[PDB]
Point group: C2
Chain length 123, copies 2
Amino acid sequence: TTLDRYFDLFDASRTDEKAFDDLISLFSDEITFVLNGQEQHGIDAWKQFVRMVFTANQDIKHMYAGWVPSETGDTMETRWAVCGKSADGSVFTQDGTDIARLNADGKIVYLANVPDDTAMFNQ
Amino acid sequence: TTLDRYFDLFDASRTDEKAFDDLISLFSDEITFVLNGQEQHGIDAWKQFVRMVFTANQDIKHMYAGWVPSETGDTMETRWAVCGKSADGSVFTQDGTDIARLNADGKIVYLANVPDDT
Ligand SMILES: [Cl-]
């Protein structure tokens, strides 16, 4: 399924030309994507966003729990886990949820990324 | 360097016995290692730990910043980032620091894994 191919293609697209092409193929040209509430539209914007992630990081890895029906609405969602290494050498992780909708052709037409609130501070 | 080979060997060891054997080769038989603030000793205990990580998880990936000298003592340390998928399907992340000591022969003789105080 397109949603199940997404994360591995995203990670492979950092270094792989064909994987990048396949990654873009998962999406409708009119994809609406949201990053912590900020909405973006279209394939040009999407390609620019993916390319930005790859220039920002020397390495990145995504793991996901599995796409399940959202409690409310017509969407599917999954928990995800990210680890990476910045272009500056430092490392990081992130946890969150992605929420998505497919069209009748099975292409991704909506994809929202919601990073969790963090709890690094302990005092 | 043995410490620079550690992380990628660790991850590759989940699916390749040659990587596991190379990983084990980095260590002194006198390895003292610390997990969750609890100390263990010896290569047998070390092998059992690595094997447990791979039964506990379907997948695991480690990223590290780079091994640098510690503020005090003769150890080296690195920040690390881990993401994984549990045997139960759930996913997780963790951040922390590893602190290591090499013996005179360059083998890992002390390794403390120190997850962040979150
Ligand atoms: Cl599973």
